[PDB]
Amino acid sequence: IANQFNSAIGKIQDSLSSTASALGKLQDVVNQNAQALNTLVKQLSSNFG
């Protein structure tokens, strides 16, 4: 049971070391808040008539 937990924590390191998209839930929340400020900055360039 200790060997299986120690082996399974070793796979957490290997997974996080390997794959790009896993933390997508947090990066998507950064990307929305950054895209919303970038859209608000681009809207200063508009003439509005």
């Binding site: 970038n38 900055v41 200063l44 360039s45």
Partner: protein, 49 residues
Amino acid sequence: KNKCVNFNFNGLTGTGVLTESNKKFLPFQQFGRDIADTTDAVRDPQTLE
């Protein structure tokens, strides 16, 4: 330079701090713009830096 001022370059009125750029404007351009369409660099009309 390096002080807050009410500038005017060729009628481009504004307020800001002027510093020596390392942006290399091709001869046909007097101004550089930002994402917000505001001027963020300018070529001085008497000494062409």
